[PDB]
Every structure is written in structure tokens, then in C-alpha cells.
Amino acid sequence: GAMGSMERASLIQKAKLAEQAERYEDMAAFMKGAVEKGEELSCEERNLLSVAYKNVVGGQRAAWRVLSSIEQKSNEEGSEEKGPEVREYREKVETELQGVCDTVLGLLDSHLIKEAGDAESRVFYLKMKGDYYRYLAEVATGDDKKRIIDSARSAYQEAMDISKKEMPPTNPIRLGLALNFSVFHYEIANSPEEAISLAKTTFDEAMADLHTLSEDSYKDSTLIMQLLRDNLTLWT
Amino acid sequence: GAMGSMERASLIQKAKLAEQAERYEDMAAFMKGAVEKGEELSCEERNLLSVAYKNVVGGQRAAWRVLSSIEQKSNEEGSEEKGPEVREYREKVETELQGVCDTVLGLLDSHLIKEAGDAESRVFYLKMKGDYYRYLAEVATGDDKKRIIDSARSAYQEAMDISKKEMPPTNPIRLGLALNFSVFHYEIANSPEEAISLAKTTFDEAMADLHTLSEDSYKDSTLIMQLLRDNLTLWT
Amino acid sequence: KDKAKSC
Amino acid sequence: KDKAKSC
Ligand SMILES: [Cl-]
Ligand SMILES: [Cl-]
Ligand SMILES: [Mg+2]
Ligand SMILES: [Mg+2]
């Protein structure tokens, strides 16, 4: 890879520069290079990896939705035939999004997940695995859609089992995992009652554990608890 | 080029889709393909070209400024030595920005400018030529800096001469050209008095011509006149 | 119906 | 000193 000649520390240093410059494709490429050095990632380095690819795939998903909406309207009754261009370009963006997802899943499979023994690292990577299979599922329409959905579900479920046994209910990673697994239930698995039940139980069990936390930890946990509340308000 | 197989009309259609999706690198690539078909560009197609590359280079310039500021701070007294990474990455972004500028200037030279006979098209392309030499000048620090600056100046000046002879003072292209030539004077040519004088005279001569315009033309012209006012307020 | 928030 | 507006 193009980053094979650059020191691991320099890749991490430049990933942070890219974030400051809002150059998230660069940031993701630097962090991919860092992962491919073969050493495990620190807490800070894991969050650099997730931030970079979250932003890249976030822009692709927003673009795919714009184009998908245009495509759907073009297939309504009374809509003028405009040729293959809308579908072609939606497919282009879709293929690039799928490529980003495959890249992340490849990093997790080779070999981040298998070397992650601590709960904080293992849960973090399994959440990521669930997230990027979810993003594949958002655009899936074929014969592998059900297996893609189950791959997201299975990764989320293993992460949930570990986090409930090994982390306190206010842990930001545990909270963000539960937030996203709830979103999976609502937006992917057609299970809104499961999504609502999970978000409520997660919020309540975190509320009851806030008294154990410092001011700084309290701020982190309540920030993510508010996202659970936002979704419950949106959904009810 | 990768767009050589796609119909001109399909490239234009997809450029508009990319804009709606805020995919400006795609938009620029589609419009580059359209230009390379060899036919002149309509008014609407010219504005698609400028919007695409303005956004691409705009993000690169914002990133270059972030990194340049970090680099400058790193070279102050008392600053810790952190190695070559800041300079390397600033150079990376800089080289990509210069590449975008060279691509645009290449399209203008082969062969948009020489085939543009109407005032509206010729002024539009010469403004673009001045703009992208200005962006090269923003990052230039070597022995060609003075020639790069003069290349921007010369293109702006030919555009100004044509626009003053061939367009009314409220023409949006004439106004945007004068706005940018004024910015060139202030930010590139170290001539703030020329920048202020040009912005004032442009604003006043447009003000006196507003009475000739329809409501829709009045709205377009006053929008750009406000940018001249903003700069005069910033500079005085 | 709108997109939900995620981490 | 800040960046001026352009078209
Ligand atoms: Cl396409
Ligand atoms: Cl670099
Ligand atoms: Mg524990
Ligand atoms: Mg005329």
C-alpha cells in the first residue's frame, strides 16, 4: 500500500492533522496505513480510525440518499423518461460506498478483532463491524440482503453480550453500541418495538449509574444518553 | 480520459445530479469530460464548470490554510521540533491544489478561451483564468511567484477591458470579476488602495445602473454588490 | 420517519 | 486581515 513506506507514528500524526483540516479521506488512508503496520491500536488511535471512516461513509450515505430519492421519483407514474443516467450515478456512488465498507470490514477481519482481548477494544471493533454491515444493508436489495442483515445483527449481539458483562451501563462505548443496535432494529430489521425497548432500557440503566461518575465522565455519558432520548422522541 | 465513452448530455445531466448530492469532485470530473468533447459551453454549462471546481479548490484552500498555520506556529521560537510531517502533509495538499489549478487552466487553454467570441463567454473564462492563477499565487513562494502573479493580473486585466466595453455595469459577471480583481489587489498584489478604489468605483457605477433592471436582474446585481460592500467594510 | 441519530 | 469575499 501507498503508506507502507511511512512510519506508524507519522501516519498517526498526519491523521490528526487531516482531522484538523477536515480532510477525512486522507485521515482514513493514514489510519488504514497505521492499522496495516500490524500493531494493536490504543484507545485514541481506535477513535481516530472510527472518526475518519465515519465521516467518509457519512458523506457517501447522504449522497446515496439524495440520488436514491431522485431515482424513486423518476419511477413514479407520470414521470418523464430521462434515460439511465440517474441509476448509473446512484450505482456509482453505491459501489464506492460498498468499497469503503468492505475496506473497514477487511481491517477488522485482518486482524484487529482477533487480537483485541480487552473488553473496550473488542466491543469497539465489533460495534464497528455491526455498523458497516448496517451501512451495506442500507443499500442492499438482492439475494444477500438477509445475510448482510444477519451479519450486522450477529456482530452487534456479540458486542452487546460482552459490554453487558464487562462494562458499566454508563460506558460511552456500551451506550453508543446500544444506540446503534437500536437504530439497526428500527431502520434495518423492521423491529421498531425492539428498537424502542432497547433505547429505553439502555437510558434507564445508565441514568441509575450516573451517581458513580466524575463530572467529566458524567458529561460524556449524558451526551450519549441524550441521543437515545432524541431517538425515543423521534420514534414515539 | 475516463469520461470519453459517455455522451456529452449525460455528463451534463450527471454534473447536475452531483451538485444536488454535493459531490463536487464528481461534478468537476463530469464537466471536464463535457469540455473535452470539444464543443463550446452554454451559459448554464459554464456555470456548472465554475461551481464544480470552485468547490473542489475551495476545500483544498481551506485545508492548506489550516496546515500552513500549524506549520508557521511550529517554526516560532520555543516550539518543539516535531519532525517533517507537518511540512510533508502541507506539501501534499498544496500539490493536489496546484494540480486542480493546472487542470482548470489547461481546459481554458485547450481550448475554451480561443473559441469564446461573445463577451459573456470570453469574460467568464478570463475571470476563471485570473482566479486560478490567483489560487496558485496564494501558495507560491519560489522564483516563479512574480510570473504567476503577473499571469493572474494579465488575465484579470483583459477581462476587465472587455467587460467595461461590452457589458453594462450591473452585469453579474462584470461585478464578480471586479470583486475578484479587487481581492487580487488586496490579498496577492499588496495593493490595498487599488483594491479599495476598484471596489468602490464598481459599486457606485452599478448603483447608478440599477434603475434599468427588472426585479429579477436587480436581485442578482444587488447580491454581488453586497459582497463589494462587505469587502470595503472589512478593509476600511 | 427521518434518520435516527447514531454514534 | 481575514479572507475577503469572492465570486
Ligand atoms: Cl456514473
Ligand atoms: Cl503526506
Ligand atoms: Mg470492566
Ligand atoms: Mg453588451
Q: For the residues of chain A, what is the DSSP string, one character each?
A: -TTTTS-HHHHHHHHHHHHHTT-HHHHHHHHHHHHTT-----HHHHHHHHHHHHHHHHHHHHHHHHHHHHHHHHTSTTPPP--SHHHHHHHHHHHHHHHHHHHHHHHIIIIIHHH--SHHHHHHHHHHHHHHHHHHHHH--STTHHHHHHHHHHHHHHHHHHHHHHS-TT-HHHHHHHHHHHHHHHHTSS-HHHHHHHHHHHHHHHHTTGGGS-HHHHHHHHHHHHHHHHHHHHH-
Contact A21 B82 (CB under 8 A): no
Angle between helix B24-35 and B8-20 (nearest 10):
160
Which residues in chain D have their CB less than 8 angstroms from residue B179's CB? 5-7
Contact A180 C2 (CB under 8 A): no
Dihedral sign from CA coordinates of B167, B202, B107, B9: negative
**Phi, psi (degrees; rounded to nearest 5) at B208:** -70, -15
For residue B76, what is the DSSP state?
Answer: S
Minimal CA separation from A119 to chain C, in Å: 18
Alpha-carbon distance of B126 to B132, in angstroms, equals 10
Within 10 Å of residue A41's Cβ, how many Cβ atoms? 21
Structure-determination approach: X-ray
Which residues in chain A have their CB less than 8 angstroms from residue B17's CB? 67, 70, 85-86, 89
Nearest CB to A227: which of C2, C3, C7? Answer: C7
Q: Residue ranges per domain, chain B? A: 8-236
**In angstroms, what CA-CA distances link A100 with A16, A25, A53, A133, D6?**
20, 10, 8, 11, 35
Nearest CA in chain C to A175: C7
Yes or no: say if A116 and A122 are a contact pair by the CB < 8 Å rule: yes
Nearest CB to A67: which of B13, B17, B59? Answer: B17
Which three-class secondary structure string do you get for B122-150?
Answer: HHHHHHHHHHHHHHHHHHCCCCCHHHHHH
Which residues in chain A have their CB less than 8 angstroms from residue C2's CB? 234
Nearest to A127 by CA among A149, A108, A150, A102: A108
**In this complex, which chains have at least 3 CB pairs below 8 Å with chain B?**
A, D
* CA B192-B197-B203 angle, 5° bins: 125
**In angstroms, what CA-CA distances link A18 with A219, B100, B208?**
27, 19, 48
Nearest to B23 by CA among A2, A199, A97: A97
Which three-class secondary structure string do you get for A37-89?
Answer: CCCCCCHHHHHHHHHHHHHHHHHHHHHHHHHHHHHHHHCCCCCCCCCCHHHHH
CB pairs B-D closer than 8 Å: 27
CA of A165 to the centre of ligand 3 (A): 8
- Per the document, the length of chain A is 236
Architecture of domain A8-236: Up-down Bundle (1.20)
Which residues in chain C have their CB less than 8 angstroms from residue A156's CB? none
Alpha-carbon distance of A218 to A214, in angstroms, equals 6
Alpha-carbon distance of A167 to A177, in angstroms, equals 12
Give how far the C-alpha of residue A47 lies from the chain's centroid of Cα atoms, to the nearest Å: 12
Alpha-carbon distance of A73 to A169, in angstroms, equals 44
Helix (H) / strand (E) element for B114: namely: helix B113-115
Minimal CA separation from B169 to chain D, in Å: 16
Cβ neighbours for B205, distance < 8 A, ≥ 6 positions apart: B169
Helix (H) / strand (E) element for B77: namely: none
Residue B131 one-letter amino acid: D
**In angstroms, what CA-CA distances link A35 with A4, A12, B141, B233?**
11, 10, 36, 50
Is the CB of A224 inside 8 Å of chain C's CB atoms?
A: yes
Nearest CA in chain D to B186: D4
Yes or no: say if B21 and A93 are a contact pair by the CB < 8 Å rule: yes
Is the CB of A113 inside 8 Å of chain C's CB atoms?
A: no
Resolution (A): 1.9
Yes or no: say if B177 and B152 are a contact pair by the CB < 8 Å rule: no
Q: Is B71 helix (H, G, I), strand (E, B) or coil?
A: helix
Yes or no: say if A93 and A67 are a contact pair by the CB < 8 Å rule: yes
Is the CB of B232 inside 8 Å of chain D's CB atoms?
A: no
Cis previous bond, A211, omega within 30:
no
